[PDB]
Design a binder for these strands. Structure first.
Ligand SMILES: [K+]
Ligand SMILES: [Mg+2]
Lengths: 225, 215
RNA sequence: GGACGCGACCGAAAUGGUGAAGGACGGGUCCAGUGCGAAACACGCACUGUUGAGUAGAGUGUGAGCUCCGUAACUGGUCGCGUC
């Protein structure tokens, strides 16, 4: 029943602007306080802003005060976060949350949206180069061989990786991306497989980066001697 | 003065069945306006406790919250597999609201040494003037591990980046990739590329290496 | 002694005016806190406050009581006089 869907996220230059929306369903926002909380990647929850019912009073974290404006359109049952003068450090997943009913759950935020990613950067959208991580012309570490794909120099997040169109899932590890000093991301996905099948079993990494219309499949093979 | 919620510990390791306790300490009186949340990787937080000690509807009762003055505790009386997650306290006594730093609760298991693999850069990547050398530490526990890069036995510094996976849903281990980045010219000026791994499950450091332009 | 009558003085329900008293006269005065109304503030209600807290105003109460100055029903008292 109760649900919240944020939208509007995406990539924006520093000093730019972006409006997020938070579509409620299953309840009417007019009877609730609505909040925005954000999470920089790898970090914790940071409270951003809120709007109180009946008075329309609004409150803001110091770190965003003056730049961000929260608001509500009851007729669309939607709330908004107008972000202006954006800085790289506003890069975060943005969640809207409902503060629940006082008698039922005090001031706890009983429902949260799935979140929308806001990337603030002067880097421009770019698809990855995808390189093989070829299995060693040796034998073993553990008893098995390791191979993979290096997904290098894309922007912004995110990218998806799978192996053999989803059929190969066991022994897979897709690493969280690092932000390189160039301002581009890079990650690798690896899989351990038996070394006896390296010449006869086929291994393809499937990489999708939607923001740049880049979808690639890379066969990973042993090369020479 | 903004209100501080100081959360400890930042992480803890525990076995299924264990009783754990997580603490938030407020910098001034927040009455009982404290909530506790659970968050799993990639997912929105879920409300567990409100008003410091009230169980939120539908939350299993192994979760409890307690208030002692300005100190607040979330206790899980007996962890279950699905309880491994990060937990956040929040004060909503006054604005601005404040979240605690979080507490990652991870599962304990037997020490497992990593399997180490090194990968030279592809000739493909070499065509573009950058060489990426990758080292994989596979399926180990605990999480602490030390990776060092050597180029012709010289210790590298400042030119690598690591990344660690979330603890695995089946065997409870970690994997780690480290990437050494060089210009193609620098890369071609040397022979031996090595990755040296130090881990608790290793009696001695393990080195995996290759020689550039061989097999 | 008494009945009737007149008058004066006293008393006096009521009442006009007056001016001091601050939480032990109260309030729809004011402040803080807690709970409730789909409600943290603002709005409403309820509860709670150990110098809550300025005595007539932070009051647009012709508030109650009281101080002082009057008026006064009277179907209360006392004294004098008249008649018997
Ligand atoms: K008063
Ligand atoms: Mg109020």
């Amino acid at each position: 029943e109760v649900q919240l869907v944020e939208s509007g996220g995406g990539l924006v230059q520093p000093g730019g602007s972006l409006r997020l929306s938070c579509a409620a369903s299953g309840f009417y926002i007019s009877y609730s306080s609505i909040h925005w909380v954000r999470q920089a990647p790898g970090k914790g929850l940071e409270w951003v802003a809120s709007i109180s019912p009946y008075s329309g009073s609004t409150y803001y974290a110091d770190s965003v005060k003056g730049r961000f404006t929260i608001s509500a359109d009851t007729s669309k049952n939607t709330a908004y976060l107008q972000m202006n003068s954006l800085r790289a450090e506003d890069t975060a997943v943005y969640y809207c949350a409902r503060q629940g009913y006082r008698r039922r759950s005090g001031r706890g935020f009983d429902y949260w949206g799935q979140g929308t990613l806001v990337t603030v950067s002067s880097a421009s959208t770019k698809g990855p180069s995808v390189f093989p991580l070829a299995p060693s012309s040796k034998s073993t570490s553990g008893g098995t061989a390791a191979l993979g794909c290096l997904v290098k120099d894309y922007f912004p997040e995110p990218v998806t990786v799978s192996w053999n169109s989803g059929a190969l899932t066991s022994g897979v590890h897709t690493f969280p991306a690092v932000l390189q000093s160039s301002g581009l991301y890079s990650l690798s996905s690896v899989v351990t497989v038996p070394s006896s099948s390296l010449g006869t079993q086929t291994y393809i990494c499937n990489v999708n980066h939607k923001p740049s219309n880049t979808k690639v499949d890379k066969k990973v093979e042993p090369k020479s001697c | 003065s903004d209100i501080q919620m100081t959360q400890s510990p930042s992480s803890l390791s525990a076995s299924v069945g264990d009783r754990v306790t997580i603490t938030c300490r407020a910098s001034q009186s927040v009455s009982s306006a404290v909530a506790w949340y659970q968050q799993k990787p990639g997912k929105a937080p879920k409300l567990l406790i409100y008003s410091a000690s009230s169980l939120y509807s539908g939350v299993p009762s192994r979760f409890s919250g307690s208030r002692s003055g300005t100190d607040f505790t979330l206790t899980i009386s007996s962890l279950q597999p699905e309880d491994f997650a990060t937990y956040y306290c929040q004060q909503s006594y006054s604005f601005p609201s404040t979240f605690g730093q979080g507490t990652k609760v991870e599962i304990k298991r037997t020490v497992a040494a990593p399997s180490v693999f090194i990968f030279p850069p592809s000739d493909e990547q070499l065509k573009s003037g950058t060489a990426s050398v990758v080292c994989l530490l596979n399926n180990f526990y605990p999480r602490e591990a030390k990776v060092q890069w050597k180029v012709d036995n010289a210790l590298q510094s400042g030119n690598s980046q690591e990344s660690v996976t979330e603890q695995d849903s089946k065997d409870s281990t970690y994997s780690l990739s480290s990437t050494l980045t060089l210009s193609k010219a620098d890369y071609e000026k040397h022979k031996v590329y090595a990755c040296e791994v130090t881990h608790q499950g290793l009696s001695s450091p393990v080195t995996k290496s290759f020689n550039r332009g061989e097999c």
